[PDB]
Each structure stands twice: as C-alpha cells, then as structure tokens.
C-alpha cells in the first residue's frame, strides 16, 4: 500500500505514535516519506547483508527476522514480512521499541539527515487529524 500523507498521519496517530517518546507526528510522517515514500512494501538491502523493511525501513540486523541476516536479533519478535503489510500496526509497535533505544529517532538515518531540525509540522499541514 502506498499511503497518502494525511492518511498515514491519521493511521500513525491512531496507533499512538504522535508524541511518542516526545516525537511529534510530523517527525514520523517525515521519516516515513524519506524511508519508504509511504510504501508499506518497500525493502532495501544494506551493505552488511541485513535488509530494511516497510514504511519505516526497520532493519533485520536487530528488530525482525528474515532468516538471512546471520548473527542478527529479532527484538520485535516478528517476521520481517509482517512489516510489509497494508496494516501498519506491526511497524508502529516495533518503531516504538526502536525509538525507545538510547538514540531516539537518530536510529533512522533518513530522519537524522532529512527531517531532524526542519519544519516537520509541514508534513501534517492540511490534515484533518
Ligand atoms: Cl507527499
Ligand atoms: Cl509535527
Ligand atoms: Cl531499523
Ligand atoms: Cl537471520
Ligand atoms: Cl544467526
Ligand atoms: Cl493501518
Ligand atoms: Cl530522544
Ligand atoms: Na534479524
Ligand atoms: Tb540499543
């Protein structure tokens, strides 16, 4: 599923991401834009052999199992394919565990380099939330 911007914002809000660990909804929409372009089916292989999955490009090195990232963990206790569903529940629950780690949203490289410090509220502008 390729979400609309406000559509994704509404879904993220409903699942309790808005202001989670202090990160406003626009930060999460911005992260999703530059991680996956709002496409739940997005996958990208990392140089180390891990793969990033879904709307928030969650990495198999630590967070989900894809059976082909030797020596990795599965801290969200979920198959990585579950992060490609049209229903973002799984991606949101896992993202909550990721951002609760010491580095907050800096764990998302695209957030740090393209969202951090910018006018992220623009990403929810005009949305009927
Ligand atoms: Cl957009
Ligand atoms: Cl915001
Ligand atoms: Cl990740
Ligand atoms: Cl594995
Ligand atoms: Cl292993
Ligand atoms: Cl959803
Ligand atoms: Cl933080
Ligand atoms: Na893994
Ligand atoms: Tb950690």
Domains of the chain: 1-129 (1.10.530.10)
The neighbouring-strand residues paired with 43 are 53
Give CA 83 to chain center in angstroms: 9
The neighbouring-strand residues paired with 65 are 79
Q: Check if 7 is active-site.
A: no
Q: What region, left, alpha or beta, does residue 105 occupy, with left being phi > 0 and alpha being psi -120 to 50 degrees? A: alpha
Q: Check if 35 is active-site.
A: yes
Experimental method: X-ray
Q: For residue 42, what is the DSSP state?
A: -
Nearest CA among 51, 45, 54, 63 for reference residue 82? 54
CA of 40 to the centre of ligand 1 (A): 14
CA of 69 to the centre of ligand 2 (A): 34
Nearest CA among 89, 78, 94, 84 for reference residue 14? 89
Tokens matching residue 78: 């979920």
Tokens matching residue 19: 């202001």
Give the Å distances, CA to CA, from 29 to 5, 65, 108, 128.
7, 25, 12, 14
Give this entry's resolution in angstroms.
1.7
Tokens matching residue 3: 């979400």
């Amino acid at each position: 599923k390729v979400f609309g911007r406000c559509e994704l914002a509404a879904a993220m809000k409903r699942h309790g991401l808005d202001n989670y660990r202090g990160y406003s909804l626009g930060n999460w929409v911005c992260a999703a834009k530059f991680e996956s372009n709002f496409n739940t089916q997005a996958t990208n292989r990392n140089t180390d052999g891990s793969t990033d999955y879904g709307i928030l490009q969650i990495n198999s090195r630590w967070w989900c199992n894809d059976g082909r990232t030797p020596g990795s963990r599965n801290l969200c206790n979920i198959p990585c394919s579950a992060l490609l569903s049209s229903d973002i529940t799984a991606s949101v629950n896992c993202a909550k565990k990721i951002v609760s780690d010491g580095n907050g949203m800096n764990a998302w490289v695209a957030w740090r380099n393209r969202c951090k410090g910018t006018d992220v509220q623009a990403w929810i502008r005009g949305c009927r939330l």
